[PDB]
Design a binder for this molecule. Sequence first.
Ligand SMILES: COc1cc(C(=O)N2CCC(N3CCN(C)CC3)CC2)ccc1Nc1ncc2c(n1)N(C1CCC1)c1ccccc1C(=O)N2C
Length: 125
Amino acid sequence: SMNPPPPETSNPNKPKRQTNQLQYLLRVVLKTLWKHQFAWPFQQPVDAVKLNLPDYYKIIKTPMDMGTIKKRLENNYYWNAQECIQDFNTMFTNCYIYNKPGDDIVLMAEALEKLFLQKINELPT
Ligand SMILES: COc1cc(C(=O)N2CCC(N3CCN(C)CC3)CC2)ccc1Nc1ncc2c(n1)N(C1CCC1)c1ccccc1C(=O)N2C
């Protein structure tokens, strides 16, 4: 099987805007995660062909990655911050679903998730 197309990062039918919370998600949250030592597996869509994972997209039907989130934020694709937060959570949950508790990649995802929640909490009122 080929890889599926990546998640859309623009959509001419979907209203878009820029908000302070969305700017924070790009300039602080995504920036912080992107530079983390464990970011690399999450910086692009899972290439199931290259990784020899013929069953990845049989199991994961809602793929998401930080490369896609980054482009979405840069493109002002979202209407609200909870949409973007959901994309991060989808990415983490996918990792937990495909893999098993305690796996190397699961620990990496858990570390990133902890940091993500810290940065979200730090959003100034
Ligand atoms: C760019 O994408 C990758 C590069 C390489 C790689 O060959 N690399 C890593 C970078 C480079 N490093 C050199 C040393 N420096 C310090 C860091 C970079 C050495 C060369 C390997 C895998 C990559 N992609 C990837 N993307 C998502 C994954 C994943 N892999 N894994 C792997 C289990 C652990 C990761 C999985 C394996 C099986 C089933 C599921 C997953 C999974 O859930 N996720 C999230």
